[PDB]
Amino acid sequence: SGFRKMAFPSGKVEGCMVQVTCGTTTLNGLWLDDVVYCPRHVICTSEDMLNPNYEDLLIRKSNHNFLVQAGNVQLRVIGHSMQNCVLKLKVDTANPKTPKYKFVRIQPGQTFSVLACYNGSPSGVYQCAMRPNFTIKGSFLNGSCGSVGFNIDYDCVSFCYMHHMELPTGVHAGTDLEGNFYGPFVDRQTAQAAGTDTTITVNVLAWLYAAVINGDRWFLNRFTTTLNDFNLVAMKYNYEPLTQDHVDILGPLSAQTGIAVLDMCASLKELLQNGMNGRTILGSALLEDEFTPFDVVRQCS
Numbered sequence: 001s002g003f004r005k006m007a008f009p010s011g012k013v014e015g016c017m018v019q020v021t022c023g024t025t026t027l028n029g030l031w032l033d034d035v036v037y038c039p040r041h042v043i044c045t046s047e048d049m050l051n052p053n054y055e056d057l058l059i060r061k062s063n064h065n066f067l068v069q070a071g072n073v074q075l076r077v078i079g080h081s082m083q084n085c086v087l088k089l090k091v092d093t094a095n096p097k098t099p100k101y102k103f104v105r106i107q108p109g110q111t112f113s114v115l116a117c118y119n120g121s122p123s124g125v126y127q128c129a130m131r132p133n134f135t136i137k138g139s140f141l142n143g144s145c146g147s148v149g150f151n152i153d154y155d156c157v158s159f160c161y162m163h164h165m166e167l168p169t170g171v172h173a174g175t176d177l178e179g180n181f182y183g184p185f186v187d188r189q190t191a192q193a194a195g196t197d198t199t200i201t202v203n204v205l206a207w208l209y210a211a212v213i214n215g216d217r218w219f220l221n222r223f224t225t226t227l228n229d230f231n232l233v234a235m236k237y238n239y240e241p242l243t244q245d246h247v248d249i250l251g252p253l254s255a256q257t258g259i260a261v262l263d264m265c266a267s268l269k270e271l272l273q274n275g276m277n278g279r280t281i282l283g284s285a286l287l288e289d290e291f292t293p294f295d296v297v298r299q300c301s
Helices: 055-061 201-213 229-237 244-249 249-257 261-274 291-301
Strands: 017-022 025-032 035-039 069-070 072-074 076-084 088-093 099-103 113-118 121-129 147-154 156-166 172-175
Touching: 017 035, 017 121, 035 156, 055 076, 113 156, 201 244, 201 249, 201 261, 201 291, 229 244, 229 261, 244 249, 249 261, 249 291
Parallel strands: 099 156
Antiparallel strands: 017 025, 017 069, 025 035, 035 088, 069 072, 076 088, 113 121, 113 147, 147 156, 156 172
């Protein structure tokens, strides 16, 4: 019983976090085998941040310009190279704690765990969701650049995000482990802002299934709707369209609970049109959209 925003256990990632210093800029890196990954803007200075030419900035550096610290052990850099917006720092020692791992890019609407780190040292772990507009609503303070986001499956860590910057609404932007930004964001000072966002409909429905699995049934009703007329109401409340694939993915939950997907949609339609009238669902007074069908199945079922 119960439902919480649950993150993956972080040990496997914690053993990969290091501190990378260059000039007076210090931030976090990820140490896998004999490579350290970090945001390339570690090579920047404040007065070249408006319009930096990273290729020029990097060609002017030597391996000894990069201090890498793994706890108390200093790691000797024996090479460096740029891959898109990350820097790969070759070091002389393979990380003995390297887990089995993969670099995966995630989709908007998918969730992951973030290990917030400062000066190479982990601070906390929380669950996140990639918003439709390719930002994340993280919790990050100065110096959290380089903290990573990940998923764990059968002992293998799929790294999907490295933190790079905070946008003006206080939401966050980063790239995947190959250095490619999520969204239309760049690592330089511009007017760039988060675009408009939508609510992740399939997650909201998954979450309503979780609730039913946990005994919250007040919002259910005997009605059913077509996928077309549901999406008519969705598009009006700034919800993403629902698809047959969404319905298929919701299958396992629908069958476990006995509530057909389109029946639950009738519930959602009602909730959007009249609010909750002072009631809560799974401890929340608003529709939660940062729980995938996978997440629910993992916690419930």
